[PDB]
Amino acid sequence: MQIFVXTLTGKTITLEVEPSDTIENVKAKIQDKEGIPPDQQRLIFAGKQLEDGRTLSDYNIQKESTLHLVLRL
Amino acid sequence: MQIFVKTLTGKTITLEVEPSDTIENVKAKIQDKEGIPPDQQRLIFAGKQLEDGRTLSDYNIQKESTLHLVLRLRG
Ligand SMILES: [Zn+2]
Ligand SMILES: [Zn+2]
Ligand SMILES: [Zn+2]
Ligand SMILES: [Zn+2]
Ligand SMILES: [Zn+2]
Ligand SMILES: [Zn+2]
Ligand SMILES: [Zn+2]
Ligand SMILES: [Zn+2]
């Protein structure tokens, strides 16, 4: 599958994805990919701030979908 | 005095402000509570989008009032 994560400076990074993959799970993927601890990032989708332990599907995300997400701190 | 902000999350969050607190001042508070840089938040009250450098009072805001919130998404 594949979803996009956008940052602050526009840098657009792709992710492999899990369909019912939790948000905790996505944060770990960003870390595996660009090394920012999950406890630092916050993801937003279509205005809403996603919370870990809810799944991509719980928020109706689909392949080709865009998570800004983006960013955190 | 207290004021209320509607988060992206949606869980209401609470702030300790003063009457003559500027808006860039409020963002900094939000940054402190939810690690979101000011330069990314945009606040709205009662329909209007508040601009930094104007004060809570210049927008007629009082106790227990609420401001919803959202991200600028500049790029
Ligand atoms: Zn840590
Ligand atoms: Zn978390
Ligand atoms: Zn968007
Ligand atoms: Zn569920
Ligand atoms: Zn004071
Ligand atoms: Zn502080
Ligand atoms: Zn600003
Ligand atoms: Zn003024």
Numbering used by the authors:
A (entry chain A): 1 to 73
B (entry chain B): 1 to 75
Lines from the paper:
Ubiquitylation is orchestrated by a series of enzymes (E1s, E2s and E3s) whose action culminates in the covalent attachment of the Ub carboxy terminus to Nϵ‐amino groups of lysine residues by an isopeptide bond. Furthermore, Ub conjugation is reversible, as the isopeptide bond can be hydrolysed by deubiquitylating enzymes (DUBs), around 100 of which are encoded in the human genome.
The crystal structure of native K6‐linked diUb (UbK62) has been determined, and this served as a reference to assess the isostery of the oxime‐linked counterpart. UbK62‐ox readily formed cubic crystals under identical conditions to those employed for UbK62, thus enabling determination of a 3.5 Å crystal structure. The topology of UbK62‐ox accurately mirrored that of native UbK62 (backbone RMSD 1.1 Å). However, unambiguous electron density for the carboxy terminal residues of the distal Ub molecule and the oxime linkage with incorporated 1 was consistent with the trans regioisomer. However, we suspect that the steric bulk of the protein reactants ensures that the favoured regioisomer upon oxime ligation is the trans species.
